[PDB]
Amino acid sequence: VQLVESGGGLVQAGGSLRLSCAASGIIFGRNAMGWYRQAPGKERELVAGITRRGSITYYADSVKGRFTISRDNAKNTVYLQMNSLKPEDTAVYYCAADPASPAPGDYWGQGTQVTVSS
Amino acid sequence: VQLVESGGGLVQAGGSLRLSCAASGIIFGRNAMGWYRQAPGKERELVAGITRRGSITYYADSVKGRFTISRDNAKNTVYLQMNSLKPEDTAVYYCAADPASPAPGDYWGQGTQVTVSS
Amino acid sequence: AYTNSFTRGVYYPDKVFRSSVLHSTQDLFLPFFSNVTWFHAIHDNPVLPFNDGVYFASTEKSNIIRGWIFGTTLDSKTQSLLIVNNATNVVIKVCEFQFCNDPFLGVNCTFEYVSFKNLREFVFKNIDGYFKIYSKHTPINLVRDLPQGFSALEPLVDLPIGINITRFQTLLALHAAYYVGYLQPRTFLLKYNENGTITDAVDCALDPLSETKCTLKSFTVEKGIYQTSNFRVQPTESIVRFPNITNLCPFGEVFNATRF
Amino acid sequence: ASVYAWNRKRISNCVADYSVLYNSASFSTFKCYGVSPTKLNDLCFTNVYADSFVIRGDEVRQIAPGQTGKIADYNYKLPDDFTGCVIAWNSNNLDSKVGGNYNYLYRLFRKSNLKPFERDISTEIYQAGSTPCNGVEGFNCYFPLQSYGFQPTNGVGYQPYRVVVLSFELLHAPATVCGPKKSTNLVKNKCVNFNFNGLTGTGVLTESNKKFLPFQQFGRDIADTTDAVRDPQTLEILDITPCSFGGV
Amino acid sequence: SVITPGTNTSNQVAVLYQDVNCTEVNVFQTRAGCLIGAEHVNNSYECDIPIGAGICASYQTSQSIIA
Ligand SMILES: *[C@@H]1O[C@H](CO)[C@@H](O[C@@H]2O[C@H](CO)[C@@H](O)[C@H](O)[C@H]2NC(C)=O)[C@H](O)[C@H]1NC(C)=O
Ligand SMILES: *[C@@H]1O[C@H](CO)[C@@H](O)[C@H](O)[C@H]1NC(C)=O
Ligand SMILES: *[C@@H]1O[C@H](CO)[C@@H](O)[C@H](O)[C@H]1NC(C)=O
Ligand SMILES: *[C@@H]1O[C@H](CO)[C@@H](O)[C@H](O)[C@H]1NC(C)=O
Ligand SMILES: *[C@@H]1O[C@H](CO)[C@@H](O)[C@H](O)[C@H]1NC(C)=O
Ligand SMILES: *[C@@H]1O[C@H](CO)[C@@H](O)[C@H](O)[C@H]1NC(C)=O
Ligand SMILES: *[C@@H]1O[C@H](CO)[C@@H](O)[C@H](O)[C@H]1NC(C)=O
Ligand SMILES: *[C@@H]1O[C@H](CO)[C@@H](O)[C@H](O)[C@H]1NC(C)=O
């Protein structure tokens, strides 16, 4: 119902960038949450996710060595840390439950833009 | 739908304490309103009440000589004044209509705690 | 080894008094002339399946058989039932209990209750959480197999417990013959005498004569031809045919459209 | 209880006053199926069951016979022939919490739909994908239960509701639960308007020779008219003869 | 349909499957249908239990059903 994102911005490839988001309990209480991304030329994909219980994490293989996913159950927030960003990582990043519906009614936040230059 | 209480606090037996509350017109417009109380070891009871019309008051006999009930129809508030409080009067006090339902859906406010020491 | 169910396994299906009437009902009854399995706790008491109601009987002298267990895995995971006569009186309890697979007598929770010469005949079923126990106790002159003849069993116990029963075991005292059969969803014509006791019954699907007896609502059939049922050839397999289209249509596209 | 693991409590051996709930005007819904509200006080039931759980407001509409949806199919299914009352009310000031009440759970993932009135409290990881999960969360592997995370600032569709589903066993079997009625005395050989545990009719009560077995409560005719009863207070059997009538 | 002597004489019965082939169901194929359990004979009698299309059945001699 309510999803927000922040921590985006323009960086040069390399360095680091930390994304953050938050959700109302309706989504935050779901079995697992993570981050998704989109960019011109490519559809939406799940980058990384963390469960609600046990803080179990998993990553897409393509991002496994540079992305870290974490959550804070006291704050009702989720974070994604990128270490050494590449130009290919330019995308709008979104907060959502790990399972998600393709239906237009499955709510998404606006997303936050991450841009990585040469 | 909205009931609030205040004027509680810790006092030594004797002295005085004035409780106050307010309600939305939904409850304030009822035929009569008053104060109820609860405490560990004892269930909820009506202490005193005042009607909407004629400012007619009545008290439980057990409290008749130390409690005074009043209301203000311009302010949409109800008050209960205690003169010389006793240790037995330690309770959480609540604002509600004089008639009330035992059903869980009959709305009550949080109540305010009055504590009386030796 | 097996025995022949010679009209045994019939009981009063409801709590309504009927008399001097032939009444057609449907319930879980021991099919007439079914194969009942022999067991002996001599020299075992295997855990047996509970299909959809079970028929039991035992031959006795000294109350060597004193109880039973009904449940599933019997290792404290779900609700299961223990009934023991205790050679004193009856105690019944249902909980997530851990059982021995070899329980014996010598010579989280939902329910608790505290209360050859002959044969004990009884049945069990569990409908909508209610464990229903029916029985009779009669003398016998037979020393191995089960007696022939008909007399319906009466309800004794009817309890809303919610017990999950897929398996069971017979409890005996040790220092031993009993039978287990199964009930089926069959239609019966039950004959109630003037005192409302069921004295006879017709198993409506045993053979064509019994079928005729149920059709005519009678235990006596006159000479002639009766039309009792229809013969229908059954399908042996199903056939499903649709054009072999591998194309998908744009349903998502009318919901995920950029503009409406 | 959480809806995925709803509680059940049995009601028996009592006088059941249903006016206390019905006329409280404290419920968002009080929908009865098979019986009308206020008629309940004139009825007798064998057992009465009260199922209880917490769901969100938009889901109250799923607690119905013949209904479908995530709760109706994975958490709490009612049968098409359900007889009973679905009673529910808003608990936004009780169950909702600041920061979110994550104690209440519902099942989102299941292999198949539920049967009427069952429960499934398994925590087995749901095999959404093709690669076996083997008990561990991951891509296309999900913990089956979700929390509601109820907050006081949510709109109504997401506010918690407390639901009690009251199931009525209107069976021929002897009643254990009856409404708040008072009894009168028996007469014999007179025409009366009778009511025995909810069984009504007009007839002449006489002493019966139809000994009823210890578990039997009434006798019945060919036409389903009863013809004998076991009195609710005294263990004797009465016959019911229709009051005389004929053409004129 | 079930062809039977009265039950006060015998519990043996014969069964007629009306208007069907015996290949689809001591078997006699006739116009009435497939008659199973009655023994067809080359003798004659008057009629006891009629079946149809000129065929009757009866119970006789140690006794069995004949057609
Ligand atoms: C009693 O326990 C058994 C398991 O031992 C349950 O059986 C399963 O039921 C589900 C129904 O959705 C089937 O899909 C499974 O294949 C069954 N498993 C096995 C091993 O048979 C049974 O449903 C439980 N029953 C109650 C309370 O009636
Ligand atoms: C039942 O027992 C008889 C022997 O009395 C045997 O011929 C028959 O095959 C048995 N039936 C089954 C299903 O085992
Ligand atoms: C009762 O059941 C709960 C699970 O709902 C389990 O954690 C607990 O250990 C059980 N208690 C006993 C005594 O078996
Ligand atoms: C019915 O009960 C009477 C005793 O009241 C008894 O004499 C009679 O034989 C019984 N009838 C049957 C069929 O058992
Ligand atoms: C179904 O299969 C036949 C045989 O290969 C083919 O001729 C026909 O076009 C197919 N139908 C579709 C819808 O592809
Ligand atoms: C049936 O047989 C019995 C002897 O068992 C006899 O007494 C009775 O009269 C016979 N009834 C008919 C209709 O033949
Ligand atoms: C039964 O089928 C056979 C062929 O298999 C045929 O010759 C015969 O006439 C058929 N009988 C009837 C009654 O249809
Ligand atoms: C009838 O007679 C024929 C010879 O004409 C023979 O083949 C057949 O088997 C006889 N059938 C019976 C029932 O006697």
Author numbering:
A (entry chain B), B (entry chain F): 2 to 119
C (entry chain C): 27 to 69, 80 to 143, 165 to 172, 186 to 245, 263 to 347
D (entry chain A): 348 to 595
E (entry chain C): 596 to 620, 641 to 676, 689 to 694
The authors write:
Coronavirus virions are bounded by a membrane that contains the homotrimeric transmembrane glycoprotein Spike, which is responsible for virus entry into the host cell. S1 binds the host cell receptor angiotensin-converting enzyme 2 (ACE2), whereas S2 catalyzes fusion of the viral and host cell membranes. The RBD is attached to the body of Spike by a flexible region and can exist in an inaccessible down state or an accessible up state. We isolated single-domain antibodies (nanobodies) that neutralize SARS-CoV-2 by screening a yeast surface-displayed library of >2 × 109 synthetic nanobody sequences for binders to the Spike ectodomain.
A prototypical example of this class is nanobody Nb6, which binds to SpikeS2P and to RBD alone with a dissociation constant (KD) of 210 and 41 nM, respectively. We obtained a 3.0-Å map of Nb6 bound to closed SpikeS2P, which enabled modeling of the Nb6-SpikeS2P complex, including the complementarity-determining regions (CDRs). Nb6 bound to closed SpikeS2P straddles the interface between two adjacent RBDs. Most of the contacting surfaces are contributed by CDR1 and CDR2 of Nb6. CDR3 contacts the adjacent RBD positioned counterclockwise when viewed from the top. The binding of one Nb6 therefore stabilizes two adjacent RBDs in the down state and likely preorganizes the binding site for a second and third Nb6 molecule to stabilize the closed Spike conformation. The structure of Nb6 bound to closed SpikeS2P enabled us to engineer bivalent and trivalent nanobodies predicted to lock all RBDs in the down state. In the case of Nb6 and mNb6, structure-guided design of a multimeric construct that simultaneously engages all three RBDs yielded profound gains in potency.
